[PDB]
Structure 1
Amino acid sequence: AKDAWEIPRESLRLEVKLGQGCFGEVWMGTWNGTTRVAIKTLKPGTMSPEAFLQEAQVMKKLRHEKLVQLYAVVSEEPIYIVTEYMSKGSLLDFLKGEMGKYLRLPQLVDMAAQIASGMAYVERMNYVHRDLRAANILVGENLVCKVADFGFPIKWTAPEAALYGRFTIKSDVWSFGILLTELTTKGRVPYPGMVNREVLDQVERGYRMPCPPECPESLHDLMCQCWRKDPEERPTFEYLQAFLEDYFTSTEPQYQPGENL
């Protein structure tokens, strides 16, 4: 028995390959011959309707302009998931690429605000992303950013989650903190020079990334709030959204552009 999200297979045209991997593939395509869409194919060898359908409900229930929207599914294998198309790809490729040159703090804080808005919706609904970071954010026209791909990357993960599996909205706040350094360095790996083992030992004994060049210290404080040892002292996304939305009036009103930020 199938639900309202199902579509017939004839309605999809896959046109350009965009991404690859062990999971499957991602294509840009057309739905019902008239609707630009992203399509994610899954190889028949990989995870079955036992763990597909449990993980489908998440993307079927949650709905917000700052989370990448499900449009349709072909559920019987081979599986196809159809979502909205984000014309600029992942945030990480965006910042690294041709556009990074031109982005400055106002745009970068704005993108942060938007993700914070998406995650504040996840927070209200009592969910947890678990792998929040630039690679899992998509960008569209007019710098619209949307959270994607809800769950090894210990550099983005809060210590309590990486050591004890305590994944909570507060461990997503930590990852947001790291995301802010990706935004403010145009997409560089965090903890540059440090292998994964080095990062746990250091973070656990108090080490935190310093202020990136040309980034205001007030913004690096926000980062340090997200990186508090004690999960419950980290701010909410409601707070973070508000802080970033209001940033240039309330916090940094004499901001003057520089060479990179």
Structure 2
Amino acid sequence: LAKDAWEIPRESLRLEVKLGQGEVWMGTWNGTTRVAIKTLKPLQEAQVMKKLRHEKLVQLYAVVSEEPIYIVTEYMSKGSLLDFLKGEMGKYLRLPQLVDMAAQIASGMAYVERMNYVHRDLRAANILVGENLVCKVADFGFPIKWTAPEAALYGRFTIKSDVWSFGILLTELTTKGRVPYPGMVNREVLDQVERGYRMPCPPECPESLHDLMCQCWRKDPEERPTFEYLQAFLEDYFTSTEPQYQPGENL
């Protein structure tokens, strides 16, 4: 059956270093350019990664539509935002760098918002990092803790359930990668969050950023901010919102 212009020769790719294991390799495409190659275990409907192109989304390069199915994309030299924040770099990141990263992610998601798509698994383990603190939304391929209640309970995934996740992602950045709802197991999160619990302000995080988290965690998904609003807020943050910001111990 008929391929499209994304298709490339099964073996026009040189796999080298293995990076994960569902498996992910670094490689070289037509001997000239470095890529990442995610391999599946037994891309049919990648009509999602094909239609999106933006500077803050990991770019699709090519596919291979036969088992084992390949997906080739740009190489992100630092790997996942989660690993980056939990590794050696986490202790040196302060609020300006973390808010900047948040802004990049909102910029990719504001594009997703315009195109009328929905990510469904926005969390730091699905943001990829390159040099110069470039972050890019990845993996449009159970993370109850990151999912809006209406989506966890009733399968209502909208751009507004993504916003909710983006708010959890903001606690990931401000805590240098901690799992959210520390001490709570999945069921206790779901019950507590339905009764109105929200994570409190993380140590040394300014109130104005916690308020932003709180708005993304509104019960009525319609009262949650847009990513366009989020991007603009984050970009202008140290002039418009926290002009007197002082670095502290950890942020």
Q: Is the 8 A contact 1:19 1:27 kept in 2?
A: yes
The answer to which structure has the higher helix fraction is 1
Q: Which residue of the partner structure matches residue 40 of structure 2?
A: 42
Gaps of 5+ in 1: 45-53
Task: Name the residue aligned to 1:110.
Answer: 100
Q: C-alpha offsets along residues 97-145 of structure 1, whole Å, 9 cap, x if unaligned?
A: 0110111100000000000000000000001001100011100011000
Within 2, Cα distance between the matches of 1:78 and 1:207? 44
TM-score (norm 1): 0.94
1:1-261 → structure 2 map (5 Å cutoff): 1-20=2-21, 24-44=22-42, 55-261=45-251
TM-superposed deviation, 1:151: 4.4
The SS at the match of 1:58 is: coil
- Contact 1:40-1:81 within 8 A present in 2 as well: yes
The separation in 2 between residues aligned to 1:171 and 1:140, in whole angstroms, is 27
CA RMSD of the aligned region, Å? 0.8
Helix, strand or coil: the match of 2:76?
coil
Question: CA offsets per residue over residues 163-192 of structure 1, 9 Å max, x none?
Answer: 111110000000000000000000000000
Query: What's the offset of the Cα at 1:76?
Result: 1.7
Q: Which runs of 4+ in 1 moved over 4 A?
A: none
- Deviation (angstroms), 1:88: 0.2
Give the drift of 1:10: 2.8
Q: Separation in 1 of the partners of 2:207 and 2:45?
A: 40
TM-score (norm. length: structure 2): 0.98
Task: Tell me how far 1:225 sits from its aligned partner.
Answer: 0.3
Task: Compute the displacement of 1:9 (Å).
Answer: 2.4
Q: Secondary structure at the match of 1:99?
A: coil
For 2:97 and 2:58, how far apart are their aligned partners in 1? 20
For residues 55 and 232 of structure 1, the distance between their equivalents in structure 2, rounded to whole angstroms, comes to 29
1:55 shift after superposition: 2.4
